[PDB]
From a paper:
To initiate filament growth, three junction proteins, namely, FlgK (hook-associated protein 1), FlgL (hook-associated protein 3), and the cap protein FliD (hook-associated protein 2), are sequentially placed at the distal end of the hook. The FlgL and FlgK junction proteins that are located between the FlgE hook and the flagellin filament are indispensable for the formation of the flagellum because both FlgL-deficient bacteria and FlgK-deficient bacteria lack functional flagella and are immotile. To investigate the role of FlgL in hook-filament assembly, we have determined the crystal structures of FlgL from gram-positive Bacillus cereus (bcFlgL) and gram-negative Xanthomonas campestris (xcFlgL).
Crystal structures for the truncated bcFlgL and xcFlgL proteins (residues 45–251 and residues 48–364, respectively), which lack ~45 N-terminal residues and ~35 C-terminal residues, were solved by multiwavelength anomalous diffraction (MAD) phasing and single-wavelength anomalous diffraction (SAD) phasing, respectively. The bcFlgL structure was refined to 2.2 Å resolution. xcFlgL was crystallized in two different crystal forms, and we obtained two xcFlgL structures (xcFlgLC2 structure in space group C2 at 1.9 Å resolution; xcFlgLH3 structure in space group H3 at 2.2 Å resolution; xcFlgL structure refers to xcFlgLC2 unless specified). Notably, the D1-D2 interdomain orientation and interface are essentially identical in the two crystal structures of xcFlgL (xcFlgLC2 and xcFlgLH3) despite different crystal contacts, suggesting that the D1-D2 orientation would not change in different environments and would be recapitulated both in solution and in the flagellum. In the xcFlgLC2 structure, the α4b helix runs downwards as one α-helix. Moreover, the N-terminal regions of the α1 helices are tilted in different directions in the two xcFlgL structures.
Residue numbers in the entry: 56 to 348, 353 to 363
Write the structure that this text describes.
């Protein structure tokens, strides 16, 4: 009846080991797909491309989003889902009204591979594909959707220039061609200043940089980064590339949208890379287990 326990520990160890190896490969391939998304997006800014060419790129991006879903729905060949957390009974990523939703859970199983010896199972898919910070990872900013001018959001960050950031959201709004106001989340007046094309705008511990010609009333929001799933980000690029771009206004809006999506993809690339690297020591410990060494624990290590 000790055979029963050894078998159970053995099978547990083999299962987690297989899953962890499949996770590592899946994160590598997600890396590659993200790198391909990044290249397609850079190319889509190219001013020589036609609307039709932009559409073909959008079509490739759609295919990449679809293959990222299949990857997110990888199985471990006992037929259990890799990225569902502990609810590894049904497909964790589902298409629903154009969004990809996560049906798995938030728990990374602690697999007991020997008495009081635990190995961390695969990450919940929420931690890989869904909970990806936006912007630069702590602040996010966008050109407002209703903007009528040609103001391009070039970059942004926390910045010690204007002092210290309180985590709050702000709005940079043009009141003349060469004048703007910054307002806080209650619409109170924080600062005003003179607009210079490509010069930093510093208020309340954050900075953004704008080029082109914002129209009167055009605004730019900035605030703490939230999270956005990888599928939505690819999706937004696809919808941006399908946009009409006949006027300077429409071109700026698409560029602003592409460029924001690209910042988010960079965050998505980093997550995959950072996630993969966070798992390597657990795989190395298992692989090198014999090099690193009579109880249940030692009898198990002597077989594997």
């Amino acid at each position: 009846r000790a055979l029963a326990a050894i078998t159970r520990f053995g099978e547990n160890a083999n299962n987690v080991q297989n899953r962890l190896g499949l996770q590592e490969n899946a994160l590598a391939q997600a890396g590659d797909k993200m790198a391909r998304v990044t290249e397609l997006a850079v190319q889509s800014n190219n001013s020589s491309l036609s609307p039709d060419d932009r559409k073909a790129i959008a079509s490739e991006l759609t295919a990449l989003r679809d293959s990222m879903v299949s990857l997110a729905n990888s199985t471990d060949g006992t037929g259990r889902y890799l990225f569902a957390g502990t609810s590894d009974g049904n497909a964790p990523f589902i298409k629903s009204n154009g969004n990809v939703l996560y049906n798995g859970d938030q728990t990374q199983k602690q697999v007991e591979v020997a008495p009081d010896t635990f190995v961390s199972d695969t990450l919940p898919g929420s931690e890989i594909f869904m909970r990806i910070r936006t912007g630069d990872g702590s602040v996010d900013a966008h050109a407002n959707a209703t903007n009528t001018g040609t103001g391009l959001l070039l970059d942004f960050s926390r910045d010690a220039s204007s002092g210290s950031w309180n985590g709050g959201s702000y709005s940079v709004q043009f009141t003349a061609a060469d004048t703007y106001e910054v307002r806080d989340s209650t619409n109170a007046l924080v600062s005003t200043g003179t607009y210079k094309d490509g010069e930093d705008i510093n208020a309340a511990g954050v900075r953004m940089r704008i080029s082109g010609a914002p129209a009167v009333g055009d605004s730019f929001q900035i605030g703490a980064s939230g999270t956005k799933d990888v599928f939505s980000t690819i999706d937004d690029m696809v919808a941006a590339l399908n946009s009409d771009t006949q006027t300077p206004t429409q071109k700026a809006a698409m560029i602003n949208t592409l460029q924001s999506s690209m910042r988010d993809i960079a965050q998505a690339s980093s997550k995959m890379i950072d996630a993969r690297a966070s798992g390597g020591a657990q795989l190395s410990v298992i692989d090198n287990a014999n090099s690193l060494l009579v109880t249940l624990k030692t009898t198990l290590s002597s077989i594997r």
